[PDB]
Design a protein around this ligand. Structure first.
Ligand SMILES: O=C1CC2(CCN(C(=O)N[C@H]3C[C@@H]3c3ccccc3)CC2)Oc2ccccc21
Ligand SMILES: O=C1CC2(CCN(C(=O)N[C@H]3C[C@@H]3c3ccccc3)CC2)Oc2ccccc21
Lengths: 546, 546
C-alpha cells in the first residue's frame, strides 16, 4: 500500500530536460551524433560530471573541465568544433528554457493533499554562475510543495549508486513497498525497482500520469482546476511595527521586488489574502499583508476617533516610514478599498499604484450629511445598527464560529437577509444557530478567524463605521482633486452591498482608471474567485506598477 | 530661552531652491525678467499656486493652470515662449536637482541631540507626477530626523498666513520666545518675527549657521564629523520566521531593494549593525539584520549540535525559503563572517554576494584535528576555556553589564589579557569589577545588550564554539571547491583575534576577491569605525551586488 511519491527534477518536474540539449546542440551544429553527450559522461564515476553531481566542485569549476572533454571527444571522432562554441552559453540557455512541468506538480500536489509524503530526489550541481538566480527561483517555487528535497550535491551521493536510495527511504521513514518513484532515466529507475519500490519511466507526462493514477488509485489526470496555493500561518514571516505609543501594526511578508500592501475589509484579517500572497510573491512582488488596525495581532484601541480615515491613513504612512519604504502599491478590499482610495488622494507620493476590490471611489456630498446619504440606500441599513457602541459587538461576539460561517458565503449561499436589520433586532435574527459550511471555506479556515477575533473582538472593527461625520469632513478637503496615479477598480457581479453600478461615475475623478470585472462573484472576492483576482491583479501590476 | 528650531524645506534644508529655477529658465531662454516667476504667483491667495500649496489640487492638476498663466504673462510682456517649452520638464529637473543641504541637517541634528524640539514647516504640494518617488525618498530621509513635519498641503494653511504659525506653536507646545525659525523667504519670516520668535533669513548656509549658533549658544559650524544615524529598537520593523518546530529567527527590517542579510558575531545582536542599517537602507537596499540563533529574540535551544555550521546554514536557507527570497547578499562579522563564507560554499545559488568583516576564509586542514590547529595559535586559548559546558556561561552571566563593558572596547582601551585564559581561571580574572565606559558605546547601548542576554544567556552563543569537530568534517566536503560568486574581505588593523594577515591566502580559494581595510580598528568593527564600514560596504554593494 502506497503512501509516498518521489519525483526527479530534470525531465519529470521540469521541462525541457537539460540533458536533452546536448543532442539538440549536436543536431543544430551538424556535429557527430553523441559527441556532446559523451563529453558530458566522460570518466564515468571518476569523471568531472560525477564530482560536480556529488558536490566536490561547483558548476563554474566544471565548465572548463567539460570544454576539455569536448576537445578530447572530437580528436577521436576526427572533427572540429565551431569558432565561438561556448559550453556556458549552451547550459545558460538550457537552464533558462527549463520550466516547471505544471501537470506533474498538480499530480504531486493532489497526492500530498490525499495524505502522501512527497519528495524530490535529484542529481544536481552547486550553481555559482552569474545567472544562478533563475534556477534558485525555480527550486524555491517547486520545493515548498514537497515534504523533502534531496539534492545529490548536498548529500554527496548520486543516482544510480544504491546508497542514495537507502538514504531516500530513511528520510521518507517508509519501506520500499509504500513508495512510487518517477524518473526519465531508466538506469536511475533500476535501483529503486530492484529494492521493491513502484517505478514509472517518464517519457511523456500524460502516460506517466496514467501509470501514476493506476498504481495510486487517485484521479490525477483530467482533474478540475485546483485552487491557487494558500498560506499556512505558522510558515509565514510575521512583522510588527509600532506606529505610535499605543499602536502596533502586524503584517505577513512574502517575496521580493516592489512593495505591495494588501488591505482587508470588515470583519476580516491578513488571511483574507491567503490565495493572493504566494501568487503575488511568485509574480515578482514583495507582499505586505496587513492586519488592519483593530484586527488580529494589530493593536485595537477602544476609542472611536482612533478609526477615522485620517488617522488610519496617517498611521499607514508611518508604517511605510518605519519600514523604510518611500512607496508601496496599495491594494484594498471593502473597508481596505476605501482606505486605499484615501491613501491615493491624500498621499499620492507614497502610493506607487492603487487597486480596489468591490469598493468604488465616491466623493463626499458637501450638500448632504453622511447619515442622510446612508438612509437614501436601504441596503446600508445595517450601518445604522453598527452605530450604537456595544450593541453589534454583543451579537457578533456571542458565537464567533456562527458569525464567520454566516458571513463568509458565496452569492448562491445567502443565509443573511440584510434589509430591516435594526427593525428585526439584529444581523442573525432569522439565521441558523449552526450554519452550514460554505464551499468557499474549510472549518479550519473559519477557526483561524475565530482565534484571531478572540483577542480584541468587534469593537475596533466596528469603530471603522463610527466616524462617518469625521470622514465626510476630511473627504470634503479632496473635492477639488483628481486621482491621476495608476488606478484599478475591480467589480464583483454578485456583491449586493458593493454593487458594480456604484462604480459607474469613477472615471470623472480617475480619468486614466483601469478596470477588472468578476462574474458570479459575491462580496468575499478573494476567497470566492481567487484564480481570477490573481489573474487581474498580476496583469495590472506587471503593466502599471513596475 | 530657546528650546525649539523650525526649518523651511526649499532653500533651507534642501538645495538648490526649486523657486530659483524659474529665474534660471528665464536667463537660459532669454525670456523677459520675472516672466516665469510672475506666472507662478498669478492670482495671489486666489491663484492656482495657493490652491496647490493648500492642497485643494494636486501638482498634475496645477501643471496645465501654470502653463495657461505663462501664456497670459507673455501676452502683456509682448513676447512668445519657445517651440517645445514644458513646465513639467522644468519642474521635473528642478525637483530632481534639489538635494539635502547636509550642513543644515547636521545643525538640526546637533540641536535635537542637545534637547531641542525640531520641526520642518513647509509650503508644499500633493505630488502625483510619475517621478514623485524621488521627492518621497527625500522627504523620508529628512523627516525621520525631526520631531514634526508640517506640510501646507496637508494642513490646508500656507505661509505667510498667520494661522499656520499659531498651528506651528500649538504643535510645538512652546511660546514664540522659545522658538528659532529659519527661512529663505523674508515675507514668510515676518509673521514668526512679529509673534516674538527668533528669525534667521537664509541666503548662504554658513552665515545662517553663524546666526543660529550665536542665538542658541551651541557649536554647529566647523563641528566634528558626526556618527552615522543609529537605530532606536522600538522604532524598527521586527520580523519573526519559524525555521523548524522549536526554532524561530528574529530580524530587524529596513528599506527596499536587493535583500542584504546581516550576520553578527559573538557575543552580539542585530543591534551590532545599528550604524549600518539606516545607511544601507538609504543606499537602496532591503536590510534584514538578524538575531543569530541563540541570541536576543531568536530561539536558543540548549543542544550543542543545534549550533554546528551545517544546521545554522540550513536554517538560514529555510529563513530565505519562508520569506520568499530566492537570494540575499550575506554580510557577516566574526562568527557571522564564518557562517557567511559557508553560505557561499554550500549554497552559492542563494547568495547574491558575500562579504566578511574581520573573519578570513581558511579551508579545513584534513591532516590536522581542529583541536591541534587551535592549540598551534596561543591567541585562541580562550576557545579551549569555552569548550566545557556551563563554565564560561557562569562567568559571562555573573554580571552582564561587566561582561559587555569589558568586551566592547576600542584597540587603545584593552582591559582583557587573553593569553593563558584557562590557566588564569577565566576571561575577567585580572579585570575590574566596574569597568569604565568605552568611547565606542553609551551606557544605554550596553543596557540593550544586557536586556537581550537576560532571555537566554550564553549557552546558545557559546555552543557556536562547541562544534569544532562537526564543522571540520563538514568543511572538508568543500575542499575541492572555490568561491566564484562576488566576495568582499574587510580587514581591521588592530583586531588581535582576527588579524589582517590571517586573510593573506584567501585569493587561492576566492580568485576574484575584492578587499577593504580599516586602519586603527579593533575587533568590534561596526561600532569602532561605522563611517568607514558603511563607505566600504555601500561602494562594494553598488559595484558587485546590483
Ligand atoms: O465609506 C465606505 C466604506 C464602505 C466599505 C464596505 N462597507 C461594508 O459595510 N462592508 C460590508 C460587507 C461587510 C458586512 C459585514 C457584515 C455585515 C454587513 C456587512 C460599507 C462601507 O463601502 C462604501 C461604499 C460606497 C461609499 C463609501 C463606502
Ligand atoms: O571558525 C572560525 C570562527 C572564528 C570566529 C571568531 N572567533 C572568536 O572567538 N570571536 C572572538 C572575538 C570574540 C570573543 C569574545 C569574547 C572573548 C573572546 C573572544 C574565533 C573563531 O574565527 C575564525 C578564524 C579563523 C578560522 C576559523 C574561524
Amino acid at each position: 500500500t502506497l503512501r509516498a511519491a518521489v519525483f526527479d527534477l530534470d525531465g519529470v518536474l521540469a521541462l525541457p530536460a537539460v540533458f536533452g540539449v546536448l543532442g539538440r546542440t549536436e543536431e543544430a551544429l551538424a556535429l557527430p551524433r553523441g559527441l556532446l553527450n559523451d563529453a558530458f559522461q566522460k570518466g564515468g564515476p571518476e569523471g568531472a560530471t560525477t564530482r560536480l553531481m556529488k558536490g566536490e566542485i561547483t558548476l563554474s569549476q566544471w565548465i572548463p573541465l567539460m570544454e576539455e572533454n569536448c576537445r578530447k571527444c572530437s580528436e577521436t571522432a576526427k572533427v572540429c568544433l565551431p569558432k565561438n562554441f561556448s559550453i556556458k552559453e549552451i547550459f545558460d540557455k538550457a537552464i533558462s528554457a527549463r520550466k516547471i512541468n505544471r501537470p506533474m506538480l498538480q499530480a504531486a500536489l493532489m497526492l500530498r493533499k490525499k495524505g502522501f509524503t512527497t519528495a524530490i530526489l535529484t542529481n544536481t550541481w552547486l550553481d555559482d554562475r552569474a545567472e544562478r538566480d533563475g534556477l534558485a527561483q525555480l527550486m524555491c517555487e517547486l520545493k515548498m510543495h514537497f515534504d523533502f528535497l534531496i539534492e545529490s550535491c548536498q548529500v554527496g551521493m548520486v543516482k544510480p549508486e544504491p546508497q542514495i536510495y537507502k538514504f531516500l527511504l530513511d528520510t521518507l521513514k517508509a519501506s520500499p513497498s509504500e513508495v512510487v518513484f518517477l524518473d526519465d532515466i531508466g538506469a536511475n529507475l533500476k535501483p529503486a525497482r530492484d529494492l521493491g519500490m513502484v517505478t514509472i519511466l517518464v517519457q511523456d507526462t500524460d502516460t506517466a500520469l496514467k501509470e501514476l493514477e493506476k498504481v495510486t488509485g487517485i484521479q490525477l489526470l483530467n482533474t478540475p482546476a485546483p485552487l491557487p496555493t494558500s498560506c499556512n500561518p505558522s510558515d509565514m514571516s510575521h512583522g510588527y511595527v509600532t506606529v505610535k505609543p499605543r499602536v502596533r501594526l502586524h503584517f505577513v511578508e512574502l517575496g521580493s521586488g516592489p512593495a505591495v500592501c494588501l488591505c482587508h475589509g470588515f470583519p476580516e484579517s491578513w488571511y483574507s489574502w491567503r490565495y493572493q500572497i504566494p501568487a503575488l510573491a511568485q509574480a515578482g512582488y514583495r507582499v505586505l499583508a496587513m492586519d488592519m488596525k483593530g484586527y488580529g495581532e494589530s493593536s485595537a484601541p477602544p476609542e472611536i476617533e482612533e478609526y477615522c480615515m485620517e488617522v488610519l491613513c496617517k498611521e499607514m504612512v508611518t508604517f511605510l516610514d518605519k519600514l523604510g519604504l518611500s512607496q508601496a502599491v496599495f491594494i484594498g478590499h471593502d473597508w481596505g478599498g476605501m482606505l486605499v482610495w484615501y491613501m491615493a488622494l491624500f498621499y499620492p507620493e507614497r502610493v506607487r499604484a492603487v487597486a480596489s476590490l468591490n469598493t468604488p471611489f465616491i466623493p463626499a456630498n458637501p450638500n448632504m450629511s453622511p447619515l442622510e446619504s446612508i438612509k437614501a440606500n436601504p441596503v446600508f441599513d445595517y450601518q445604522l445598527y453598527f452605530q450604537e457602541p456595544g450593541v453589534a459587538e454583543a451579537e457578533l461576539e456571542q458565537n464567533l464560529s456562527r458569525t464567520f460561517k454566516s458571513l463568509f458565503r458565496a452569492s448562491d449561499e445567502s443565509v443573511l437577509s440584510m434589509h430591516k436589520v435594526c427593525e428585526a433586532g439584529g444581523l442573525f435574527v432569522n439565521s441558523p444557530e449552526e450554519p452550514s459550511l460554505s464551499r468557499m471555506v474549510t472549518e479550519e479556515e473559519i477557526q483561524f478567524y475565530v482565534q484571531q477575533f478572540k483577542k480584541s473582538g468587534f469593537r475596533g472593527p466596528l469603530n471603522w463605521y463610527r466616524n462617518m461625520e469625521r470622514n465626510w469632513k476630511w473627504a470634503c478637503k479632496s473635492l477639488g482633486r483628481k486621482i491621476l496615479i495608476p488606478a484599478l477598480m475591480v467589480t464583483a457581479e454578485k456583491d449586493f452591498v458593493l454593487v458594480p453600478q456604484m462604480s459607474q461615475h469613477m472615471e470623472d475623478w480617475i480619468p486614466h482608471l483601469k478596470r477588472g470585472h468578476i462574474e458570479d462573484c459575491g462580496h468575499w472576492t478573494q476567497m470566492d474567485k481567487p484564480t481570477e483576482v490573481n489573474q487581474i491583479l498580476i496583469k495590472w501590476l506587471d503593466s502599471d506598477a513596475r
